[PDB]
Design a protein around this ligand. Structure first.
Ligand SMILES: CSc1nn(-c2ccccc2)c(N)c1C#N
Ligand SMILES: CSc1nn(-c2ccccc2)c(N)c1C#N
Lengths: 296, 301
C-alpha cells in the first residue's frame, strides 16, 4: 500500500499564452504556445509525483500519436500508467486553453470525445492492495459510486491501519455528480459548484453542504485568492489564507495542484489545518509559473 | 526518392496547424466549456496551394519552416495524406511550429482567432541557396519575409540565365498581406498575384483599378493577377489588355476558407500546362468557385 491512485481524465491541453483576453470577433497573435498533458486527475498525478509520492493514473485512453505524447509525459514524471483503460473506439480529448499572461486566468474549450469512460467493470480488475489513497475525479457518477462501494467493501475486511483512504472531486455544476458527496473520507467541492448551488463563500458552502457527506468525512472547498476552508466531524471550520505569487501568470491546473497537495499532506499524516495550508501554498507557487515544474 | 528534372511545382510559405472549435456561446474569460465540434487542419497559403496542386494532378513540393515536434508530425502526415513532397522543409532548432486556435460562435457565425506566435524563423535566403532547383519547373512564393525572398528570387533569376528557354523555371509571387515591405515583391516573377484585401488597402475599389494602378510596379513581361471573389478575376499582361472571367458561384456557399489559394494554385497549374492567361484565369475561377461549395478540398477534383 505505497501508491496513490487518481481516477479521472487525461486530456491534451493545447495552450496559447496571450497578453490580453481576446474580444469576440477579434484576431490577436499569442506570445507563446505549448502542449501540456492535462485532465484533472492527470494534473494531480503530475503534482503528486513532483511532491515525491509514488502514484498511478487510471483513465480512458485511445491509441494514437497524441496518446503517445501523453504516455511519454506520464513516464517522464514516473506516473504509473499500467492501470489505463485503453479503448478501441474514440479519439483522445483535447482542449484549447487560453492563458491570459497579465492575470493568469485560463479559459478552456474542451473537445470531449465519445471516448468511453472508465467503468466499474474496469475498476473491479484493479489490485487495491498497492494503494494507500484513491482519489476519484467525479465524471460518470452512477458508475463511480459502484467503484466506491467496491473500495468500502475492501475496507471492511482490513485493519484500520490498512484502510484505503478515499477522496472525491465534485467540480462541475452537474447534478448526476452530487451523489458522490456522498462517499470518501475527504470531499472536494469547487467554488463553481458551490456558487451554482446558491452559496457565496467557502464557509457558507461548507455549512450548507456538510449534511451530504458520509459520516466522519472532511468537506473541502477552495476559493481562489480567497484561500480555502475545510470542515470535519467536530463542526470546527478551518481556514487557510491563499499564497498568491506576486505575479500570477498561469492558473491552469491550480485546483488540481491544490487537491493533489491536500491529499499528499493528509496521506503523510498531517492535520487538516496543515494540509489546507499546504494545499494553498503549493497551488500558489504553481500560479507564479508556467506548467508544473518548479513547484518543488 | 528520385524526382525527375523539371517535374515539380514548388510553393514556399507558411504551414500552420489550425484548431477550429464551434461553440454555442462565446466563452467568458476564466470559464470551462465544451465545444460542439473541433477540427485540426493544416492551414497556410502555400500549404493550401500545395494541396490543390496535388488534387489537380501536379507533382508538388512545399518549402516552409517547421520545428521538430508533435505539431510538425501532424502537419507532415497531413501533407503526405495530400501527396505533397515535404523533403525541402527547413527544419529549425528554435521556435514553435505555427499553430492557431479559432473559435466559431455557432449562433452568429463570428470568428475569434488566436494567431500563431512569432518565434519560428521564416525560410532564409541561405536555406534557399541549399536547394537544388533542377527538380522544379515552377516556383511560387508566398510573400512574407521580403528582403530574404528577394534574394531567393534573384537566385532563381541567376539560375535561369544559364538555361535554354525550355528549362527555364517559371516564377510566381503572392502579395496578400497589406504590408509595405511586400510591395517590393511586385518587381519579381513572371506571375504576380495581389489580393483583393491588399488592393483595397492601397485604395483601389475593383480588380481593374488595382491592375491598372499597380501594373507599373511589375517587371517587364510579367502578368499581374487579381481575384475579387464573387466579382470574378482579372489579369493584365505586357500587351495592356485587361482580361476577365466571371465567378462560378456554387449551388450554395459552404466554405470559402482557402478559396484564394485554390484560385492561385489553379491559375499556376493551368499556366504550367501551357494554357493561355485567359484560359488560366477561367480555370482558376471554376476550381475556386467549386471549392466554395465544398467543405475543405475533397470535392475540387
Ligand atoms: C486556495 S488554492 C488557490 N490559490 N489560488 C490563487 C490565489 C491567489 C492568486 C492566484 C491563485 C488559486 N487559483 C487556487 C486554486 N484552486
Ligand atoms: C475569383 S475566384 C473566387 N470565387 N469565389 C466565389 C465566387 C462566388 C461565390 C463564392 C465564392 C471566391 N470566394 C473566390 C476567391 N478567392
Amino acid at each position: 500500500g505505497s501508491q496513490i491512485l487518481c481516477v479521472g481524465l487525461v486530456v491534451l491541453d493545447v495552450i496559447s499564452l496571450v497578453d490580453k483576453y481576446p474580444k469576440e470577433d477579434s484576431e490577436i497573435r499569442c506570445l507563446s504556445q505549448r502542449w501540456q498533458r492535462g485532465g484533472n486527475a492527470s494534473n494531480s498525478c503530475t503534482v503528486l509525483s513532483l511532491l515525491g509520492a509514488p502514484c498511478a493514473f487510471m483513465g480512458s485512453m485511445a491509441p494514437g500519436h497524441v496518446a503517445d505524447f501523453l504516455v511519454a509525459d506520464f513516464r517522464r514524471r514516473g506516473v504509473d500508467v499500467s492501470q489505463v483503460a485503453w479503448q478501441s473506439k474514440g479519439d483522445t480529448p483535447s482542449s484549447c486553453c487560453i492563458i491570459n499572461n497579465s492575470n493568469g486566468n485560463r479559459t478552456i474549450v474542451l473537445h470531449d470525445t465519445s471516448l468511453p469512460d472508465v467503468s466499474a467493470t474496469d475498476f473491479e480488475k484493479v489490485d487495491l492492495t498497492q494503494f494507500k489513497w484513491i482519489h476519484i475525479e467525479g465524471r460518470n457518477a452512477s458508475e463511480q459510486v459502484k467503484m466506491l462501494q467496491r473500495i468500502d467493501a475492501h475496507n471492511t475486511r482490513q485493519p484500520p491501519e490498512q484502510k484505503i483512504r478515499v477522496s472525491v472531486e465534485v467540480e462541475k455544476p452537474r447534478e448526476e455528480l452530487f451523489q458522490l458527496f456522498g462517499y470518501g473520507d475527504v470531499v472536494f467541492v469547487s467554488k463553481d459548484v458551490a456558487k451554482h448551488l446558491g452559496f457565496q463563500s467557502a464557509e457558507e458552502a461548507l455549512r450548507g453542504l456538510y449534511g451530504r457527506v458520509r459520516k466522519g468525512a472532511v468537506l473541502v472547498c477552495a476559493w481562489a485568492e480567497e484561500g480555502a476552508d475545510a470542515l470535519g466531524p467536530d463542526g470546527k471550520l478551518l481556514h487557510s489564507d491563499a499564497f498568491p505569487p506576486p505575479r500570477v501568470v498561469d492558473t491552469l491546473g491550480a485546483g488540481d495542484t491544490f487537491n493533489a497537495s491536500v491529499i499528499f499532506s493528509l496521506s503523510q499524516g498531517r492535520s487538516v489545518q496543515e494540509a489546507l495550508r499546504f494545499g494553498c501554498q503549493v497551488a500558489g507557487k504553481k500560479c507564479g509559473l508556467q506548467g508544473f515544474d518548479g513547484i518543488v
